[PDB]
Design a protein around this ligand. Sequence first.
Ligand SMILES: Nc1ncnc2c1ncn2[C@@H]1O[C@H](COP(=O)(O)O)[C@@H](O)[C@H]1O
Ligand SMILES: Nc1ncnc2c1ncn2[C@@H]1O[C@H](COP(=O)(O)O)[C@@H](O)[C@H]1O
Lengths: 493, 493
Amino acid sequence: MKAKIRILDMFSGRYTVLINEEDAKEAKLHPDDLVKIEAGKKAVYGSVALSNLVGKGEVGISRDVLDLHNFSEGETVSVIPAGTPESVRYIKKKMHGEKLRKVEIEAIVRDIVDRKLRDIEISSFVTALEINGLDMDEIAALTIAMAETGDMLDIDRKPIMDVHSIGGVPGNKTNILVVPIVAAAGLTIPKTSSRAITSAAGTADVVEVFADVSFSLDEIKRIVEKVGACLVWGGALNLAPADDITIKAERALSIDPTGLMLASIMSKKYAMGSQYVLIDIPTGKGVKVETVEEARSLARDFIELGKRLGQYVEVAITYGGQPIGHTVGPALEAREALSALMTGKGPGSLIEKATGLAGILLEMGGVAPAGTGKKMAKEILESGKAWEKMKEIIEAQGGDPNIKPEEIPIGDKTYTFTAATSGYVTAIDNRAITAIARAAGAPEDKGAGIELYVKVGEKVKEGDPLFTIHAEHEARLDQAIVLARRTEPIRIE
Amino acid sequence: MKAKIRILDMFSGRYTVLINEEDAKEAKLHPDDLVKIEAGKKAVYGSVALSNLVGKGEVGISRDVLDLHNFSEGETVSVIPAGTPESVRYIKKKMHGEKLRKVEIEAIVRDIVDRKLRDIEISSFVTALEINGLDMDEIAALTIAMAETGDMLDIDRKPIMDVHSIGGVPGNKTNILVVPIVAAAGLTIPKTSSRAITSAAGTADVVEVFADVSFSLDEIKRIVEKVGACLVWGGALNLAPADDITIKAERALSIDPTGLMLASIMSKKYAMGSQYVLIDIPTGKGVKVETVEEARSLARDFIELGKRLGQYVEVAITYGGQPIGHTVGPALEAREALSALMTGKGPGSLIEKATGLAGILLEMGGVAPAGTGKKMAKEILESGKAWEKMKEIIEAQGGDPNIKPEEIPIGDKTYTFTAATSGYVTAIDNRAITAIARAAGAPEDKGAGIELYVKVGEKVKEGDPLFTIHAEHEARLDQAIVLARRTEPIRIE
Ligand SMILES: Nc1ncnc2c1ncn2[C@@H]1O[C@H](COP(=O)(O)O)[C@@H](O)[C@H]1O
Ligand SMILES: Nc1ncnc2c1ncn2[C@@H]1O[C@H](COP(=O)(O)O)[C@@H](O)[C@H]1O
């Protein structure tokens, strides 16, 4: 079917091709059919939609197509039905429990970037990975292929330092402190973060509260070269594009398969040119890694994988048993991160973790002598040096450097739980806490989340507030409250 | 968020809700977000697409939504973001290899029919089932829930007979013969069939060549009551509606998970009201069941499942080692089935299988004394009685009762493979044959397929025709030739 391109103003989150109903009938095209649209060299894969929105001889392409392609309005194109990708066969092999060849893995990823493989296929591959897993060879191959399928950042500074968390632990806004501290010491730390996957707020969600996080790689180079650091969303750019698509399936299913997770973090690091990388693994009940043996094993994977990519990797196994700091959800976490930086003061759990992580990086970067990195990190934070650096990052990223953290808006609707009985907190359930924060509307509603007044081992008297739920909407707040009652996230002995 | 309905002539194969960009920003709505559209009783779950096609305060819904939901233009509606469905947790529990409780299974089915769970979740569920499976309790729970989810056909005749094949074997147009034969005997047989899953052609695809296959339940009742039988597409009607949604993922991935398969076939039989059910299990190399012992196990599952539904189930374990008859793909298969009915003459593999299955049903039906059913079926075929019944079914289904089978168009692009050496055919690879036929464009191109000239144990001379490939498009033919050349489906010794 040959047609003239019309650009339709809609974003479905997929490549949408609008086909004339008469034209579609003539061409035997059905809704959600996979088609290829080509003119000369240029080609795109889209999902068919039938409508009268498009005139005869007219094909409509959604705005999504525009970003990675170059199709002009009225340009003549050929629309041809596209067959099931050969790569589905490879997805089926993984499903059966078979190890994938490098060439097979390469085929799947390119298919993902190409959009030949769609939600059903991608979800199937992710589910297969979750149930059947990957060995180190598959992961290394997956990581490299993911990285190779995108652009690579070029930064004139070296060496390039990086920090990443596998997350899971609630309220982990820690790296927001860490980057300004490392950059303040003069090291180069261009950080990329995903949005929430299994949690209430991903770091990008938190940063987005006070600054833009979506940039082009060119924009990223300029910011990092001028400021020495960035806190940006990995998704927004053509860095490991396969990863952005794969994460969406993971987010929907509330899963983060370890082999995929390793490939996802490391592929972005390789794309960014990171040489010295620090990985944080929250460990404990309610998180991705329950035990230290599990954490150590995971640490070895990160280290072996980095070695294969030519990267120096160090891992910190940290306590993930409870939420970090006092906040869950994007605005609340942002307020906590910003105030801690600006005043140099904040919750012990956040400050100690952040200084320790930054300290490892400072030593790795060679700016701190062995064993003095954590102390140096504290001085940088306390002196307001990290704050000055953060102001620069925020200004470079379209934020207001004069922002007042306590003035950042949080959810209008609130309900506070109080201690039923006098006692001491014996546990906080991380999974329950995340679920409640999500019920409140996080992270889509930045204001939504939980403020936590208690931590484990702390004595409490009856009527002492345990936590407050924040929500933009009353319906969301009520759902969170209902969930909170069933869950009993805070346990008092 | 409150909005007013605008019905748009768009069909995406999914429930897509168009949201104004300014409105989306206010409501924190992003592409592919799930939203619930509510009026009073009226409820629908849709996938958000941001567009400048609709004004502020307007939500655009595809006219598709109107089929099962009575929305009207300009109606005030509530648009609220839907949280991740609770059933996703159950899907996740399945990924972890856990046994699903009845409530968990019921919740998944409610969510599928509600369109609450979309392609990602459904694909994840099908994949998880494929890797981890279901036990009998779960399958029984799945079957009842799927049946209960939809309407029940009321036919004023009893007993109701049905036949179903698990398929897998290529060229299984066999039940096309069986239904007219059983009906000719005055028995009531309202057959439903799926389109292709793992095969080149589903029975529905084959029947569609000569007659309409999509009908309302009211239409099915009218045809079956008048004619006593039907050959229709199961997908088109609200019987076990969940099954139709899951099959799409199954078709895309080319998998038919066994527990899902049992629940799918049996739920439809139960919804239809079938009391006596004959299940055909093709057994052999290149098909879903490799061995007889495996077939007997699957047979036991079908029988026990039927007992739970209060149905009498009989199972025929047939030979699936090679393609039935001489054709693969929808038009070719139709020509072979219609010709066999019309002349009473056709390939031995098809006629013998069809009469044998029809015979079991005739005996079950009480129309034939024990052990005479196959003979009776052959008499019905040879006398033209089956053909007269088929002409009735066809007329009732909107087809031409007077069509000539020889005249049905088939793909005009052909290539014939010939014997490289002299010898005897020792094997035919079903998996290769289905793949080649699919490469040819089957079933989407009805003309596409394979005509098979040889069968196992047959002596061949170098240069004897082995099979011919049919395609409607040159490119499709060329890809098929390539596969066939690499594949070498026919083994000569
Ligand atoms: N597979 C992954 N890919 C990218 N980032 C991840 C991944 N897993 C965890 N993260 C980081 O941890 C947070 C998301 O994980 P979660 O806490 O499970 O939502 C984000 O801030 C990410 O930067
Ligand atoms: N799970 C299933 N649901 C419905 N029909 C099926 C199923 N499995 C096999 N069939 C029948 O077998 C054919 C499709 O399976 P396949 O042979 O794998 O394409 C159709 O003619 C169906 O009626």
